[PDB]
């Protein structure tokens, strides 16, 4: 299925991913596709931020759902 992924400077990724993919898969995609490190990576849906290993179906997330990305650098 497709999904959406919205940064803060209203760039939209799109990505195909299944329900049974963790929040850390999604951002492996987004690695693939952008370069970007999932530690820089914070993913927000449905007001949540989203936790590395639950999945996408924890969240509810659904065909053609808008996910947010927001950067950020490691603790530390």
């Given at each position: 299925?497709?999904?959406?992924?919205?940064?803060?400077t209203?760039?939209?990724?799109?990505?195909?991913?299944?329900?049974?993919?963790?929040?850390?898969?999604?951002?492996?995609?987004?690695?693939?596709?952008?370069?970007?490190?999932?530690?820089?990576?914070?993913?927000?849906?449905?007001?949540?931020?989203?936790?590395?290993?639950?999945?996408?179906?924890?969240?509810?997330?659904?065909?053609?759902?808008?996910?947010?990305?927001?950067?950020?650098?490691?603790?530390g």
């Amino acid at each position: 299925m497709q999904i959406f992924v919205k940064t803060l400077t209203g760039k939209t990724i799109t990505l195909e991913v299944e329900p049974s993919d963790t929040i850390e898969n999604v951002k492996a995609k987004i690695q693939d596709k952008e370069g970007i490190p999932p530690d820089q990576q914070r993913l927000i849906f449905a007001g949540k931020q989203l936790e590395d290993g639950r999945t996408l179906s924890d969240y509810n997330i659904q065909k053609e759902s808008t996910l947010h990305l927001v950067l950020r650098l490691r603790g530390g």
